[PDB]
């Protein structure tokens, strides 16, 4: 048993949403068995929008009665999820499960898929170089890092390498955060002060492997010998 | 309508020990139809107990559930590494149903000093109009701290968003950034911007920060 889910991954504010529900391997045909639909705001909790039992017997949330509909098709066997009056609030990973009698609930989750409901565009990422001011306290390490901003969707995987190509282990990786109708992200590294204050390498490249764009920048080091 | 509070909302626990998870109903459930679930960030969530007392094919028998009414709780026996993840406790007799808050387990480590960096804007991100001052907080223990900015001895609010990292796997250690945003405008009419961090294991609060000009 298994499910799928499916949709777009970019919805403007006030319009429609429309996820479909993949499921393959059982029949809407005995007693107990449903499926409902579960969203989770980065952040929060579980919460749940709407149940489907057998004999064409649907439930509805008080708290969003008379703004979502539940229809499904048993010769395509999936449940079809409508959603309309879109806020930026609202934006969630949505997920469908299924209910294997009447005590058994949610015996078996799918993937989900996120749908991101923002009025801007999915425009490509801009990186910005960050030179460390530290000074009169050189400490352990120095930090660099790299300001990866407007971006959508969130999807992002930072590497950092040195001038001849290297490799770094950083794994400092920062979630995103929406301000303004935009996420935001910050990605640092450590280095060695010793490194810095030795080979002429002078500064090192950030890159961003997201699909709107293939742009990397390079942050130079502040350097302090 | 059944409101769901789950407490305490992060609780520290070590390898080992027993965990006990606390689920709060605003009334009575009838059948005592209450179900647990565990949840790992990435993944999907996945079921562990129905009913509160049955467990489901797939679940270790570490896990047991117990107490009626209003008042359950979930006990753990042999804590794993890979458990320290949130869990929580929904009722299935509303009809429709609710979902609670949930906690969130970590694990249990010594106090670390954490390490704090200012990057003051570039040039080029000047040219646009908008400048991003970040403070960053590495290595530090608990995960609870306190980030305030001062800047000409003003003390800013409601222009902080402030973004946390999840535990470390090798670590156990946290880490969290905040970005500082205002018009460029504004910018240019202040000379030092310093962000305030304050800490358990620090004797006195650290204050970094920088020159106009000089960076
Ligand atoms: C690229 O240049 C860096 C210099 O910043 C090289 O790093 C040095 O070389 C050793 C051996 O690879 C590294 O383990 C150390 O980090 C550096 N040495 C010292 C003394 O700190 C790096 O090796 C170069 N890359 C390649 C492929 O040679």
């Known amino acids: 048993v298994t499910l799928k889910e499916s949709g777009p991954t970019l919805v403007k504010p006030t319009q429609t949403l429309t996820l479909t529900c993949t499921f393959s391997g059982f029949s809407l045909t005995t007693t107990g068995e449903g499926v409902g639909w579960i969203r989770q705001p980065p952040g929060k909790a579980l919460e749940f929008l709407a149940f489907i039992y057998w004999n064409d017997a649907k439930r509805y949330n008080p708290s969003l009665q008379s703004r979502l509909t539940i229809t499904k098709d048993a010769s395509k066997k999936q449940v079809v999820l409508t959603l309309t009056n879109l806020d930026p609030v609202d934006t969630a990973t949505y997920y469908c499960?299924?209910?294997?009698?009447?005590?058994?609930?949610?015996?078996?989750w799918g993937q989900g898929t996120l749908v991101t409901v923002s009025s801007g565009s999915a425009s490509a990422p801009t990186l910005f170089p960050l030179v460390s001011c530290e000074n009169s306290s050189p400490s352990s390490t120095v930090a660099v890092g790299c300001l990866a901003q407007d971006f959508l969707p969130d999807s992002i995987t930072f590497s950092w390498k040195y001038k001849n190509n290297s490799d770094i282990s950083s794994t400092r990786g920062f979630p995103s955060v929406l301000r303004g109708g935009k996420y935001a992200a910050t990605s640092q590294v450590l280095l060695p002060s010793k490194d810095v204050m030795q080979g002429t390498d002078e500064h090192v490249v950030c890159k961003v492997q997201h699909p709107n764009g293939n742009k990397e920048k390079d942050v130079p080091l502040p350097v302090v010998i | 309508e059944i409101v769901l509070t789950q407490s305490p909302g992060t609780l520290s626990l070590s390898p080992g020990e027993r965990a006990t998870l606390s689920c709060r109903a605003s009334?009575?459930?009838?059948?005592?139809?209450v179900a647990w679930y565990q949840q790992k960030p990435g993944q999907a969530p996945r079921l562990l107990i129905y009913g509160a007392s049955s467990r489901a094919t797939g679940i270790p028998d570490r896990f047991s559930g117990s107490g009626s009414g209003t008042d359950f709780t979930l006990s753990i026996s042999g804590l794993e590494p890979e458990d320290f993840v949130v869990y929580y406790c929904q009722q299935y007799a509303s009809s429709p149903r609710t979902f609670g808050q949930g906690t969130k387990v970590e694990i249990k480590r010594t106090v670390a000093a954490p390490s704090v960096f200012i990057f003051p804007p570039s040039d080029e991100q000047l040219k646009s109009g908008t400048a991003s001052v970040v403070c960053l907080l590495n290595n530090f223990y608990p995960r609870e701290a306190k980030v305030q900015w001062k800047v000409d001895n003003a003390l800013q609010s409601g222009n902080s968003q402030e973004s946390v990292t999840e535990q470390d796997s090798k670590d156990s250690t946290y880490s969290l950034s905040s970005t500082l945003t205002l018009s460029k405008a504004d910018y240019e009419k202040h000379k030092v911007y310093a962000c305030e961090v304050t800490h358990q294991g620090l004797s006195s609060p650290v204050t970094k920060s920088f020159n106009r000009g000089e960076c």
């Open positions: 009334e009575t459930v009838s059948n005592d139809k």
């Open positions: 499960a299924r209910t294997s009698g009447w005590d058994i609930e949610f015996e078996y």
